[PDB]
């Protein structure tokens, strides 16, 4: 149905996302159990990691477009990522390595995320009708990799240890690299302009030097979240000022604050919702026992099923509003399950968490994808920078929000943790409901401004 390089790009993306989510699904538990972090330290450190992973995505589009070429940058990114996964596996011999290894992953993701999608775009003549379907399948590729990793990585870490989990992440990247190199011939006339000139070693050295500096800066920021906080606070207020001095952009500003709220909520899946499943949900569904950390896999699961349906099935600001109402309902459902539908021993049915994750995934399907197009349709490089800075800040804020559910290591009674989770989830749901309402009220004015 699709050009041949589509299938190469599909499987490279699948395996790269498997490596990434193999780490993401186990990271907070690894912090708590393996490094002895409290739940609060683990949550804010996960927030810092996610902020860097997300904010550095801006680098890879530039490196691929203007310095080395898309295809060269896919190769370099995959190599830096694989190195990061194996360094993470090595951190079990050398615990002092952990932050460097995570910084290496962040920088590696930063170099690689934007480039396969770019490549896929060049596999189709410019107004080909199959583009929409191909990109919907690209998203599904991402979520099949994430579904596999979030399902199996906690199980693998329980049975064989973290070194094996992380080395398998590395192996997934290696086979992504092998599939690319084996298929290089399919994309010989596909690329950005630098792909077709010989490689400039000056620019490659600049890219490697900048990568290493960034690996060290990331390691430091993740080790000292108290300076990540002020760096992003002052940087954010300043870039807010520099946005305000310099009327279709105000739509981007209010939509950026709404995207920030969305990312604060998305950030709860590997942290507070993860530990909620651990502490206050039954670890059995349809008669099968599971690792509760695998419950994170319900997000890609619901995307995999729902992205085709919703492709088959207002316009921009209303889609954002709908996504925000869906997310609000996910957290109000979490709160409700804890308030009224729990056991005498403090445990709730996992069908409630299946529903929480359905609501949250529908929110994802309405907001995240739809917003990039809105960004691409209302607007340049500066707004990309401000966007990435603020959404990284959103992930830091999300780690901080998650700390309100943090449980001390000596607590063992589910009836003590249940009300903490329900208070925080209920208040998140109520605030997000308010945010969704103001979004609705502005939907008409917003929809006028897009004209």
């Amino acid at each position, epitope marked *: 149905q699709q050009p041949r390089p589509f299938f190469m790009i599909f499987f490279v993306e699948l395996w790269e996302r498997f490596g990434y989510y193999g780490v993401q699904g186990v990271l907070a538990v690894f912090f*708590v*159990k393996q490094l002895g972090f409290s739940q609060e330290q683990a949550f804010v450190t996960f927030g810092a990691f996610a902020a860097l992973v997300y904010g550095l995505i801006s680098i890879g589009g530039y490196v691929g477009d203007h310095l080395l070429g898309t295809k060269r940058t896919i190769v370099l990114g995959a190599l830096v990522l694989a190195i990061g996964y194996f360094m993470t596996g090595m951190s079990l011999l050398k615990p002092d390595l952990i932050f460097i290894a995570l910084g290496t992953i962040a920088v590696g993701n930063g170099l690689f995320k934007a480039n396969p999608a770019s490549l896929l775009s060049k596999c189709y003549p410019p107004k080909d009708p199959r583009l929409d379907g191909a990109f919907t399948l690209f998203y599904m590729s991402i979520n099949i990799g994430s579904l596999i990793a979030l399902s199996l990585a906690p199980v693998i870490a*329980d*049975r064989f*240890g973290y070194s094996v989990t992380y080395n398998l992440c590395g192996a997934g990247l290696i086979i992504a690299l092998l599939v690319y190199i084996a298929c290089r011939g399919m994309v010989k006339d596909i690329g950005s302009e630098p792909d077709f000139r010989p490689m400039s070693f000056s620019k490659l050295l600049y890219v490697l030097l900048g990568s290493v500096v960034m690996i060290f800066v990331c390691a430091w920021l993740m080790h000292n979240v108290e300076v990540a906080n002020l760096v992003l606070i002052v940087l954010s207020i300043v870039v807010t000022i520099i946005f305000f001095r310099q009327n279709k952009m105000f739509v981007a500003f209010v939509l950026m604050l709404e995207a920030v709220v969305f990312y604060i909520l998305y950030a709860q899946m590997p942290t507070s919702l993860n530990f909620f499943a*651990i*502490n*206050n949900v*039954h*670890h*059995e569904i349809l008669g099968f*026992s599971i*690792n*509760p*950390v695998s419950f994170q896999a319900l997000n890609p699961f619901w995307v995999v099923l729902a992205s085709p349906i919703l492709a088959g099935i207002l316009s921009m600001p209303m889609k954002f509003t709908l996504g925000m109402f869906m997310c609000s309902l996910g957290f109000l459902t979490a709160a409700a399950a804890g308030m009224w539908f729990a*056991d*005498a*021993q*403090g*445990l709730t049915s996992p069908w409630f968490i299946v529903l929480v994750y359905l609501f949250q995934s529908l929110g994802e399907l309405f907001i995240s994808a739809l917003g990039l197009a809105m960004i691409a349709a209302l607007v340049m490089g500066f707004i990309l920078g401000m966007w990435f800075l603020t959404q990284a800040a959103a992930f830091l804020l999300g780690g901080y929000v998650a700390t309100f559910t943090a*449980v001390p*290591d*000596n*607590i*063992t*009674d*589910p009836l003590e*943790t249940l009300p903490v989770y329900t208070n925080v989830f209920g208040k998140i749901g109520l605030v997000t409901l308010g945010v969704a309402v103001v979004m609705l009220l502005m939907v008409p004015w917003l929809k006028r401004m897009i004209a």
Partner: nanobody
Amino acid sequence: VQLVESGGGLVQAGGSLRLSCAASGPTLSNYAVGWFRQAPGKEREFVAGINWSSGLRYKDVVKGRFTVSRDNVKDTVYLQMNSLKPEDTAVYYCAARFGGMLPLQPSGYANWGQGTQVTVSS
């Protein structure tokens, strides 16, 4: 995934016993291990447990007599039972649940040992 209990047996009132729970496949380190007991004609009841990060929980009637502990190198959980009384006679089971919680009812635990008989004679 399967726990093996050992160390039960017959003892006189005021004596001591040590139960131990060892797991086969997965490492017990990620698990709260609870000890349950079922006396003749009654339901399994929570006795004592240790979570994955050294938090402890006890039934009222065994505080000051039973101690739960964990040998994290040998991957083993222990129940040290001192000042034993006839009314401690029961089948004892270890059970394992992922994480930091020790729920009071058997339905909170997925993995079960087979049980060791403990008898305390007057």
